[PDB]
Amino acid sequence: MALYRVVLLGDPGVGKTSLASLFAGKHEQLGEDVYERTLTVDGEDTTLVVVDTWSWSQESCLQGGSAYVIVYSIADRGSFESASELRIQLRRTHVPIILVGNKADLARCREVSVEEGRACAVVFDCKFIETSATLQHNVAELFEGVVRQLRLRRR
Numbered sequence: 001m002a003l004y005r006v007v008l009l010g011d012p013g014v015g016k017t018s019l020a021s022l023f024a025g026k027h028e029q030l031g032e033d034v035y036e037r038t039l040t041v042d043g044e045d046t047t048l049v050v051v052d053t054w055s056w057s058q059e060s061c062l063q064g065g066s067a068y069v070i071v072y073s074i075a076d077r078g079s080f081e082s083a084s085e086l087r088i089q090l091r092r093t094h095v096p097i098i099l100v101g102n103k104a105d106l107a108r109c110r111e112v113s114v115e116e117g118r119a120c121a122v123v124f125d126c127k128f129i130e131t132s133a134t135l136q137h138n139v140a141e142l143f144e145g146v147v148r149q150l151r152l153r154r155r
């Protein structure tokens with residue numbers, strides 16, 4: 001068991017809140033865009049607190065995270081470009097970074113190739129996956145992957 005803060009970054013409209021809601025699953029909470037769940041992975045439980053807020057919290061945001069998930073939409077070149085900008089922001093401030101290509105189901109609107117997503121992880125030195133929140137594809141696998149990468153830090 002452990003607890004980690006996972007921060008969701010990316011342009012508006014790429015599906016950050018959708019991915020977080022699927023992670024949260026099916027009022028007294030101070031603050032609103034923070035999602036908590038304990039996941040069982042490789043027979044072991046781990047809690048992630050997934051932050052979806054992308055000011056003291058705005059300044060601290062890129063320094064507090066145990067892991068960062070930078071999301072873009074495969075149907076929007078602009079969002080992919082600004083993904084690259086976000087890694088550099090993170091640099092300017094030893095932490096897992098996942099580059100996520102969301103909206104994989106829009107396979108006919110594809111503006112960003114799989115190869116382009118892969119190259120970008122290579123250039124960022126980080127992990128890569130494509131998901132769809134509307135088909136519920138690779139979402140569980142995204143967050144389970146984050147847990148595994150975090151556990152490689154500790155060991």
Ligand SMILES: Nc1nc2c(ncn2[C@@H]2O[C@H](COP(=O)(O)OP(=O)(O)O)[C@@H](O)[C@H]2O)c(=O)[nH]1
Pocket residue numbers: 010011012013014015016017018019102103104105106131132133134135
């Ligand atoms: N087709 C498709 N639409 C998605 C996907 N993820 C999110 N959306 C849609 O894109 C819009 C923006 O989603 P939202 O989660 O608010 O994006 P956010 O600004 O990054 O939080 C919503 O209308 C979603 O239904 C996806 O994987 N596939």
Ligand SMILES: [Cl-]
Pocket residue numbers: 013014073075076103
């Ligand atoms: Cl889009």
Ligand SMILES: [Mg+2]
Pocket residue numbers: 016017018
């Ligand atoms: Mg949102």
